Write a protein that binds this ligand. Structure first.
Ligand SMILES: N#Cc1ccc2[nH]cc(CCCCN3CCC(NC(=O)c4cccc5c(C#N)c[nH]c45)CC3)c2c1
Ligand SMILES: N#Cc1ccc2[nH]cc(CCCCN3CCC(NC(=O)c4cccc5c(C#N)c[nH]c45)CC3)c2c1
Length: 292
């Protein structure tokens, strides 16, 4: 399982993939926009994102890259970016993904700085929580939930997804005392380095705070070590200027010191479902037959 990737029904002929332009450096190599033939039912061609493994990468790194794709083969959720294919024969190694035309949510929020309505903010919150509920139900703990690791579609739908954020402009969101997203981590994760569904919920509260501040750096002014201490000693982020009270109260629930006191993602959605737009009932994990 380690050491080898076996090409399968996800393998795409490299001749069916064309790359048009760069999207940015991912954690294993450059990511491109392009077009893939035959990857979506009833579409002769589909616009896609294309992750690559850099030429200088090691044998082991190629496998890690491929195992990350392998884990997503199981998933099919409206609120999680979809795997579409793999090219593991010859070079370069490629992974083909659903294209999110408006990019990552951190960048998007920052672009709005010289404001999104409460209804808009709630829609984003529910979409993110729904994708996370789906993943957690399928025994997937994310470990790096953050606005930079959510993506925005042409119609503004937010989905869980990323190309690896440790090596580009948000590299300073990680601390290497392995790389740890310390400003997004629960007190218990900061202490013992274990991640759980409960710590994903902590991180979700930070994502709400990002939405409410147009992606300020959490704990701005504190160094990484000062953040570790602050959070482990029971400190919290301040209520953002002009923040709707209902959003801050949700943050506070996510930031219970005791992980067992926090809501689950399903409980979070239950608390805001009345404010979700028409359509959510039809596409969500929460309302689906799978949620049981
Ligand atoms: N290919 C592909 C592909 C296709 C469709 C997709 N839709 C959504 C995603 C991204 C899902 C999130 C995956 N990421 C979650 C954090 C993981 N982090 C680690 O695996 C990890 C590795 C080493 C040390 C630590 C650590 C510590 N200390 C905490 N996490 C890690 C990296 C992958 C996605 C990816
Ligand atoms: N920062 C920021 C920011 C900036 C601009 C934004 N505009 C909208 C949002 C909120 C995110 C929610 C996006 N939503 C837009 C309508 C979509 N709904 C539909 O697309 C739809 C809903 C119901 C039936 C059908 C249908 C049928 N049959 C075809 N489409 C639909 C669902 C996602 C938003 C957030």
């Amino acid at each position: 399982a380690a050491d080898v990737y076996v090409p399968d029904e996800w393998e795409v002929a490299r001749e069916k993939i064309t790359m048009s332009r760069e999207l940015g450096q991912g954690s294993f190599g450059m990511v491109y926009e392009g077009v893939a033939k035959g990857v979506v039912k009833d579409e002769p061609e589909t616009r896609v994102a294309i992750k690559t493994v850099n030429e200088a990468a090691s044998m082991r790194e190629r496998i890690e890259f491929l195992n990350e794709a392998s884990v997503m083969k199981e998933f099919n959720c409206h609120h999680v970016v979809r795997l579409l294919g793999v090219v593991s024969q010859g070079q370069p190694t490629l992974v083909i993904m659903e294209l999110m035309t408006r990019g990552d949510l951190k960048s998007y929020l920052r672009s709005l700085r010289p404001p999104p309505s409460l209804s808009k903010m709630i829609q984003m919150a529910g979409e993110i929580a729904d994708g996370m509920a789906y993943l957690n139900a399928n025994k997937f703990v994310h470990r790096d939930l953050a606005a930079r690791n959510c993506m925005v579609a042409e119609d503004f739908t937010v989905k869980i997804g990323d190309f690896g954020m440790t090596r580009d402009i948000y590299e300073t969101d990680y601390y290497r005392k392995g790389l740890l997203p310390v400003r997004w981590m629960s007190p218990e994760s900061l202490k013992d380095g274990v991640f759980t569904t409960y710590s994903d919920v902590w991180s979700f509260g930070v994502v709400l705070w990002e939405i409410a501040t147009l992606a300020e750096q959490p704990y701005q002014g504190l160094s990484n070590e000062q953040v570790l201490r602050f959070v482990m000693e029971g400190g919290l982020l301040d209520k953002p200027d002009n923040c709707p009270d209902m959003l801050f109260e949700l943050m506070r629930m996510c930031w219970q010191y005791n992980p067992k006191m926090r809501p689950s993602f399903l409980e979070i959605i239950s608390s805001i479902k009345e404010e979700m737009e028409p359509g959510f009932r039809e596409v969500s994990f929460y309302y689906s037959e799978e949620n049981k």
